[PDB]
Amino acid sequence: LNCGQVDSKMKPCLTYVQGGPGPSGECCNGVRDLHNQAQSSGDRQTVCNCLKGIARGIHNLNLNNAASIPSKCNVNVPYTISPDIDCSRIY
């Protein structure tokens, strides 16, 4: 699947979306990586669901940093590495 890769690349984005400093560029290119991997909704599930669990394991995740991954890489994904995105509605 992809939840495994997505996790390995969305777990390092934690220091940014939560640490504060970042992103390192590879973060937005990582979520964009999902963009090239998942093609249909059933494909995001692994991805989105991943960023969900991962993003949902930090002391105080920051939505601002986790809300600019797409606004920066211009990917336009529906979900993000956060404890609140929505995979049931991945368009």
CSV table of N, CA, C and O in Angstrom, one decimal:
chain,number,residue,atom,x,y,z
A,1,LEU,N,0.9,-1.2,0.0
A,1,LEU,CA,0.0,0.0,0.0
A,1,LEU,C,0.9,1.2,0.0
A,1,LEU,O,2.0,1.2,-0.5
A,2,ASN,N,0.4,2.3,0.5
A,2,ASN,CA,1.1,3.6,0.6
A,2,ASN,C,1.2,4.1,2.0
A,2,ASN,O,2.0,5.0,2.3
A,3,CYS,N,0.3,3.7,2.8
A,3,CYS,CA,0.3,4.2,4.2
A,3,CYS,C,1.7,4.0,4.8
A,3,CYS,O,2.1,4.8,5.6
A,4,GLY,N,2.4,3.0,4.4
A,4,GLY,CA,3.7,2.7,4.9
A,4,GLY,C,4.7,3.9,4.5
A,4,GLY,O,5.3,4.5,5.3
A,5,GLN,N,4.8,4.1,3.2
A,5,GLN,CA,5.7,5.2,2.7
A,5,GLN,C,5.2,6.5,3.3
A,5,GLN,O,5.9,7.2,4.1
A,6,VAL,N,4.0,6.9,3.0
A,6,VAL,CA,3.4,8.1,3.5
A,6,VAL,C,3.8,8.3,5.0
A,6,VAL,O,4.1,9.4,5.4
A,7,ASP,N,3.7,7.3,5.7
A,7,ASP,CA,4.0,7.4,7.2
A,7,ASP,C,5.5,7.8,7.3
A,7,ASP,O,5.8,8.7,8.0
A,8,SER,N,6.4,7.0,6.7
A,8,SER,CA,7.8,7.3,6.8
A,8,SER,C,8.1,8.8,6.4
A,8,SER,O,9.1,9.4,6.9
A,9,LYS,N,7.4,9.3,5.5
A,9,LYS,CA,7.7,10.7,5.1
A,9,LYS,C,6.8,11.7,5.8
A,9,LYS,O,7.0,12.9,5.8
A,10,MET,N,5.7,11.3,6.4
A,10,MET,CA,4.9,12.3,7.2
A,10,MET,C,5.2,12.3,8.6
A,10,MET,O,4.8,13.2,9.4
A,11,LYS,N,5.9,11.3,9.1
A,11,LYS,CA,6.4,11.3,10.5
A,11,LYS,C,7.5,12.3,10.7
A,11,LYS,O,7.7,12.7,11.9
A,12,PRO,N,8.3,12.6,9.7
A,12,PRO,CA,9.4,13.6,9.9
A,12,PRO,C,8.8,15.0,9.8
A,12,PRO,O,9.4,16.0,10.3
A,13,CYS,N,7.7,15.1,9.2
A,13,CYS,CA,7.0,16.5,9.0
A,13,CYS,C,6.5,16.9,10.4
A,13,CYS,O,6.0,18.0,10.5
A,14,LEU,N,6.6,16.0,11.3
A,14,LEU,CA,6.0,16.3,12.7
A,14,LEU,C,6.8,17.5,13.3
A,14,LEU,O,6.3,18.4,13.9
A,15,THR,N,8.1,17.4,13.2
A,15,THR,CA,9.0,18.5,13.8
A,15,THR,C,8.6,19.8,13.2
A,15,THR,O,8.8,20.9,13.9
A,16,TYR,N,8.0,19.8,12.1
A,16,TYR,CA,7.6,21.1,11.5
A,16,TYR,C,6.2,21.5,11.9
A,16,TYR,O,5.9,22.4,12.6
A,17,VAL,N,5.2,20.7,11.4
A,17,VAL,CA,3.8,21.0,11.8
A,17,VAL,C,3.6,21.2,13.3
A,17,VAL,O,2.7,21.8,13.7
A,18,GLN,N,4.5,20.6,14.1
A,18,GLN,CA,4.4,20.8,15.5
A,18,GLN,C,5.6,21.5,16.1
A,18,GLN,O,5.4,22.4,17.0
A,19,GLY,N,6.8,21.1,15.7
A,19,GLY,CA,8.0,21.8,16.3
A,19,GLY,C,7.9,23.3,16.0
A,19,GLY,O,8.1,24.1,16.9
A,20,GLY,N,7.5,23.7,14.9
A,20,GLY,CA,7.3,25.2,14.6
A,20,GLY,C,8.3,25.6,13.4
A,20,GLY,O,7.8,26.3,12.5
A,21,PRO,N,9.5,25.1,13.4
A,21,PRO,CA,10.5,25.4,12.4
A,21,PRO,C,10.2,24.6,11.1
A,21,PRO,O,10.0,23.4,11.2
A,22,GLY,N,10.2,25.2,10.0
A,22,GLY,CA,10.0,24.5,8.7
A,22,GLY,C,9.0,25.2,7.8
A,22,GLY,O,8.7,26.4,8.1
A,23,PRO,N,8.5,24.6,6.8
A,23,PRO,CA,8.8,23.2,6.5
A,23,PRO,C,10.2,23.1,5.9
A,23,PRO,O,10.8,24.1,5.5
A,24,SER,N,10.7,21.9,5.6
A,24,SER,CA,12.0,21.8,5.0
A,24,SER,C,11.8,21.6,3.5
A,24,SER,O,12.7,21.2,2.8
A,25,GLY,N,10.7,21.8,3.0
A,25,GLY,CA,10.4,21.7,1.5
A,25,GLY,C,10.0,20.2,1.2
A,25,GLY,O,9.0,19.9,0.6
A,26,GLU,N,10.8,19.3,1.8
A,26,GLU,CA,10.5,17.8,1.5
A,26,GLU,C,9.1,17.5,2.2
A,26,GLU,O,8.5,16.5,1.8
A,27,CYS,N,8.6,18.4,3.1
A,27,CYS,CA,7.3,18.1,3.7
A,27,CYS,C,6.2,18.3,2.6
A,27,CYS,O,5.4,17.4,2.4
A,28,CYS,N,6.2,19.5,2.0
A,28,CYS,CA,5.1,19.7,1.0
A,28,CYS,C,5.4,18.8,-0.2
A,28,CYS,O,4.5,18.3,-0.8
A,29,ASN,N,6.6,18.5,-0.5
A,29,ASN,CA,6.9,17.6,-1.6
A,29,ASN,C,6.5,16.2,-1.2
A,29,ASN,O,6.3,15.3,-2.0
A,30,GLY,N,6.5,15.9,0.1
A,30,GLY,CA,6.1,14.6,0.6
A,30,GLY,C,4.6,14.4,0.4
A,30,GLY,O,4.2,13.4,-0.2
A,31,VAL,N,3.9,15.3,0.9
A,31,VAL,CA,2.4,15.2,0.7
A,31,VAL,C,2.1,15.2,-0.8
A,31,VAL,O,1.3,14.5,-1.3
A,32,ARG,N,2.9,16.0,-1.6
A,32,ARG,CA,2.7,16.0,-3.0
A,32,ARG,C,3.1,14.5,-3.5
A,32,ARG,O,2.5,14.0,-4.4
A,33,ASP,N,4.0,13.9,-2.8
A,33,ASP,CA,4.4,12.6,-3.2
A,33,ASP,C,3.1,11.7,-3.1
A,33,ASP,O,2.8,11.0,-4.0
A,34,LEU,N,2.4,11.9,-2.1
A,34,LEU,CA,1.1,11.2,-2.0
A,34,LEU,C,0.3,11.5,-3.2
A,34,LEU,O,-0.4,10.7,-3.8
A,35,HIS,N,0.2,12.8,-3.5
A,35,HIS,CA,-0.5,13.3,-4.7
A,35,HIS,C,-0.2,12.4,-5.9
A,35,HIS,O,-1.1,12.0,-6.7
A,36,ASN,N,1.1,12.1,-6.1
A,36,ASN,CA,1.5,11.2,-7.3
A,36,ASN,C,1.2,9.8,-7.0
A,36,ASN,O,1.0,9.0,-7.9
A,37,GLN,N,1.2,9.4,-5.8
A,37,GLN,CA,0.9,8.0,-5.4
A,37,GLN,C,-0.6,7.7,-5.5
A,37,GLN,O,-1.1,7.0,-6.4
A,38,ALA,N,-1.3,8.2,-4.5
A,38,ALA,CA,-2.8,7.9,-4.5
A,38,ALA,C,-3.4,8.6,-5.7
A,38,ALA,O,-3.1,9.7,-6.1
A,39,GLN,N,-4.3,7.9,-6.4
A,39,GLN,CA,-5.0,8.4,-7.6
A,39,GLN,C,-6.5,8.6,-7.4
A,39,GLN,O,-7.1,9.5,-7.8
A,40,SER,N,-7.1,7.6,-6.7
A,40,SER,CA,-8.5,7.7,-6.4
A,40,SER,C,-8.7,7.8,-4.9
A,40,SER,O,-7.8,7.8,-4.1
A,41,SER,N,-10.0,8.0,-4.5
A,41,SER,CA,-10.2,8.1,-3.0
A,41,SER,C,-9.7,6.9,-2.3
A,41,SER,O,-9.0,7.0,-1.3
A,42,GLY,N,-10.1,5.7,-2.7
A,42,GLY,CA,-9.6,4.5,-2.1
A,42,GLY,C,-8.1,4.5,-1.9
A,42,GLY,O,-7.6,3.8,-1.1
A,43,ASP,N,-7.4,5.3,-2.7
A,43,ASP,CA,-6.0,5.3,-2.6
A,43,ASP,C,-5.5,6.3,-1.5
A,43,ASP,O,-4.6,6.1,-0.8
A,44,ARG,N,-6.3,7.4,-1.4
A,44,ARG,CA,-5.9,8.4,-0.3
A,44,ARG,C,-6.1,7.7,1.0
A,44,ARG,O,-5.2,7.8,1.9
A,45,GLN,N,-7.2,7.0,1.2
A,45,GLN,CA,-7.4,6.3,2.5
A,45,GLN,C,-6.1,5.9,3.2
A,45,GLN,O,-5.8,6.4,4.2
A,46,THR,N,-5.3,5.1,2.5
A,46,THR,CA,-4.0,4.7,3.1
A,46,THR,C,-3.2,6.0,3.4
A,46,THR,O,-2.9,6.3,4.6
A,47,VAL,N,-3.0,6.9,2.5
A,47,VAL,CA,-2.3,8.1,2.7
A,47,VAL,C,-3.0,9.0,3.8
A,47,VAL,O,-2.6,9.1,4.9
A,48,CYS,N,-4.1,9.6,3.4
A,48,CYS,CA,-4.8,10.5,4.3
A,48,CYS,C,-4.9,9.8,5.7
A,48,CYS,O,-4.4,10.3,6.7
A,49,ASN,N,-5.5,8.7,5.8
A,49,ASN,CA,-5.7,8.0,7.1
A,49,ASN,C,-4.3,8.0,7.8
A,49,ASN,O,-4.2,8.2,8.9
A,50,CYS,N,-3.2,7.7,7.0
A,50,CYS,CA,-1.9,7.7,7.6
A,50,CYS,C,-1.6,9.1,8.3
A,50,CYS,O,-1.6,9.3,9.5
A,51,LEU,N,-1.5,10.1,7.5
A,51,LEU,CA,-1.3,11.5,8.0
A,51,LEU,C,-2.2,11.8,9.2
A,51,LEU,O,-1.9,12.6,10.1
A,52,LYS,N,-3.3,11.1,9.2
A,52,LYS,CA,-4.3,11.3,10.3
A,52,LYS,C,-3.7,10.7,11.6
A,52,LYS,O,-3.4,11.4,12.6
A,53,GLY,N,-3.5,9.4,11.6
A,53,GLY,CA,-2.9,8.7,12.8
A,53,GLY,C,-1.6,9.4,13.2
A,53,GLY,O,-1.4,9.8,14.3
A,54,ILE,N,-0.7,9.5,12.3
A,54,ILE,CA,0.6,10.2,12.6
A,54,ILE,C,0.3,11.6,13.2
A,54,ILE,O,0.6,11.9,14.3
A,55,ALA,N,-0.2,12.5,12.4
A,55,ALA,CA,-0.5,13.8,12.8
A,55,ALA,C,-1.3,13.8,14.1
A,55,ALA,O,-1.4,14.7,14.9
A,56,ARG,N,-2.0,12.7,14.4
A,56,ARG,CA,-2.7,12.5,15.7
A,56,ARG,C,-1.9,11.8,16.7
A,56,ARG,O,-2.4,10.8,17.3
A,57,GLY,N,-0.7,12.2,16.9
A,57,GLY,CA,0.2,11.6,17.9
A,57,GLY,C,1.2,12.6,18.4
A,57,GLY,O,2.3,12.2,18.8
A,58,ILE,N,0.9,13.8,18.3
A,58,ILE,CA,1.8,14.9,18.7
A,58,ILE,C,1.2,15.6,19.9
A,58,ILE,O,0.0,15.7,20.1
A,59,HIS,N,2.1,16.2,20.7
A,59,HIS,CA,1.6,17.0,21.9
A,59,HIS,C,0.6,18.0,21.5
A,59,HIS,O,-0.5,18.0,21.9
A,60,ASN,N,1.0,19.0,20.7
A,60,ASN,CA,0.1,20.1,20.3
A,60,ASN,C,0.3,20.4,18.8
A,60,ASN,O,0.9,21.4,18.4
A,61,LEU,N,-0.1,19.5,17.9
A,61,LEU,CA,0.1,19.7,16.5
A,61,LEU,C,-0.4,21.1,16.1
A,61,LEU,O,-1.3,21.7,16.7
A,62,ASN,N,0.2,21.7,15.1
A,62,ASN,CA,-0.1,23.1,14.7
A,62,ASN,C,-0.9,23.0,13.3
A,62,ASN,O,-0.3,22.6,12.4
A,63,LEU,N,-2.1,23.5,13.3
A,63,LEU,CA,-2.8,23.4,12.0
A,63,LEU,C,-2.2,24.4,11.0
A,63,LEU,O,-2.2,24.1,9.8
A,64,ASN,N,-1.8,25.5,11.5
A,64,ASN,CA,-1.2,26.5,10.6
A,64,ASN,C,-0.1,25.9,9.7
A,64,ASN,O,-0.1,25.9,8.5
A,65,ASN,N,0.9,25.3,10.4
A,65,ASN,CA,2.0,24.6,9.7
A,65,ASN,C,1.4,23.4,8.9
A,65,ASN,O,1.8,23.2,7.8
A,66,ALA,N,0.6,22.7,9.5
A,66,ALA,CA,-0.1,21.5,8.8
A,66,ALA,C,-1.2,22.0,7.9
A,66,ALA,O,-1.9,21.2,7.3
A,67,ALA,N,-1.3,23.3,7.7
A,67,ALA,CA,-2.4,23.8,6.8
A,67,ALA,C,-1.7,24.6,5.6
A,67,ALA,O,-2.3,25.1,4.8
A,68,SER,N,-0.4,24.5,5.6
A,68,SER,CA,0.3,25.2,4.5
A,68,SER,C,1.1,24.2,3.6
A,68,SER,O,1.7,24.5,2.6
A,69,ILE,N,1.0,22.9,4.0
A,69,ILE,CA,1.7,21.9,3.1
A,69,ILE,C,1.3,22.0,1.7
A,69,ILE,O,2.1,22.1,0.8
A,70,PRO,N,0.0,22.0,1.5
A,70,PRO,CA,-0.6,22.1,0.1
A,70,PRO,C,-0.5,23.6,-0.4
A,70,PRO,O,-0.2,23.8,-1.6
A,71,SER,N,-0.8,24.5,0.4
A,71,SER,CA,-0.7,25.9,0.0
A,71,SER,C,0.7,26.3,-0.5
A,71,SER,O,0.9,27.2,-1.2
A,72,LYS,N,1.7,25.5,0.0
A,72,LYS,CA,3.1,25.8,-0.4
A,72,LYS,C,3.4,24.9,-1.6
A,72,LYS,O,3.9,25.4,-2.6
A,73,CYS,N,3.3,23.6,-1.6
A,73,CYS,CA,3.6,22.8,-2.7
A,73,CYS,C,2.5,22.9,-3.8
A,73,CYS,O,2.6,22.3,-4.9
A,74,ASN,N,1.5,23.7,-3.6
A,74,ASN,CA,0.5,23.9,-4.6
A,74,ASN,C,0.0,22.5,-5.1
A,74,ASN,O,-0.2,22.2,-6.2
A,75,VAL,N,-0.3,21.6,-4.1
A,75,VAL,CA,-0.8,20.2,-4.5
A,75,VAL,C,-2.3,20.2,-4.5
A,75,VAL,O,-3.0,19.7,-5.4
A,76,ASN,N,-2.9,20.9,-3.6
A,76,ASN,CA,-4.4,21.0,-3.5
A,76,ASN,C,-4.9,19.7,-2.9
A,76,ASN,O,-6.0,19.2,-3.4
A,77,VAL,N,-4.3,19.1,-1.9
A,77,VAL,CA,-4.9,17.8,-1.4
A,77,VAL,C,-6.0,18.2,-0.4
A,77,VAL,O,-6.1,19.3,-0.1
A,78,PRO,N,-6.9,17.2,-0.1
A,78,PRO,CA,-8.0,17.5,0.8
A,78,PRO,C,-7.6,17.3,2.2
A,78,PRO,O,-8.1,18.0,3.1
A,79,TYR,N,-6.8,16.3,2.4
A,79,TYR,CA,-6.4,16.0,3.8
A,79,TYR,C,-5.0,16.6,4.1
A,79,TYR,O,-4.4,17.3,3.3
A,80,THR,N,-4.5,16.4,5.3
A,80,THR,CA,-3.1,17.0,5.6
A,80,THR,C,-2.6,16.2,6.8
A,80,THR,O,-3.3,15.5,7.4
A,81,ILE,N,-1.4,16.5,7.2
A,81,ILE,CA,-0.8,15.8,8.4
A,81,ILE,C,-1.3,16.5,9.6
A,81,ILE,O,-0.7,17.4,10.2
A,82,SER,N,-2.5,16.2,10.0
A,82,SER,CA,-3.2,16.9,11.2
A,82,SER,C,-4.2,15.9,11.9
A,82,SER,O,-4.6,15.0,11.3
A,83,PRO,N,-4.5,16.2,13.1
A,83,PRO,CA,-5.4,15.4,13.9
A,83,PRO,C,-6.9,15.9,13.6
A,83,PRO,O,-7.8,15.8,14.4
A,84,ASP,N,-7.1,16.5,12.4
A,84,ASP,CA,-8.5,16.9,12.1
A,84,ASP,C,-8.9,16.8,10.6
A,84,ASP,O,-10.0,17.0,10.3
A,85,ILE,N,-7.9,16.6,9.8
A,85,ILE,CA,-8.3,16.5,8.3
A,85,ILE,C,-9.4,15.5,8.1
A,85,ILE,O,-9.9,14.9,9.1
A,86,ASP,N,-9.8,15.3,6.9
A,86,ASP,CA,-11.0,14.3,6.7
A,86,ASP,C,-10.6,13.4,5.5
A,86,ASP,O,-10.5,13.9,4.4
A,87,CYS,N,-10.6,12.1,5.7
A,87,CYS,CA,-10.2,11.2,4.6
A,87,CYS,C,-11.6,10.7,4.0
A,87,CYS,O,-11.6,10.3,2.9
A,88,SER,N,-12.6,10.7,4.8
A,88,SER,CA,-13.9,10.2,4.3
A,88,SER,C,-14.4,11.1,3.1
A,88,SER,O,-15.3,10.8,2.4
A,89,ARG,N,-13.8,12.2,3.0
A,89,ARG,CA,-14.2,13.2,1.9
A,89,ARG,C,-13.0,13.6,1.1
A,89,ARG,O,-12.8,14.8,0.8
A,90,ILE,N,-12.2,12.7,0.7
A,90,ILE,CA,-11.0,13.0,-0.1
A,90,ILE,C,-11.4,13.1,-1.6
A,90,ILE,O,-11.7,12.1,-2.2
A,91,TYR,N,-11.5,14.3,-2.1
A,91,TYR,CA,-11.9,14.4,-3.5
A,91,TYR,C,-10.6,14.4,-4.4
A,91,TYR,O,-10.2,13.3,-4.8
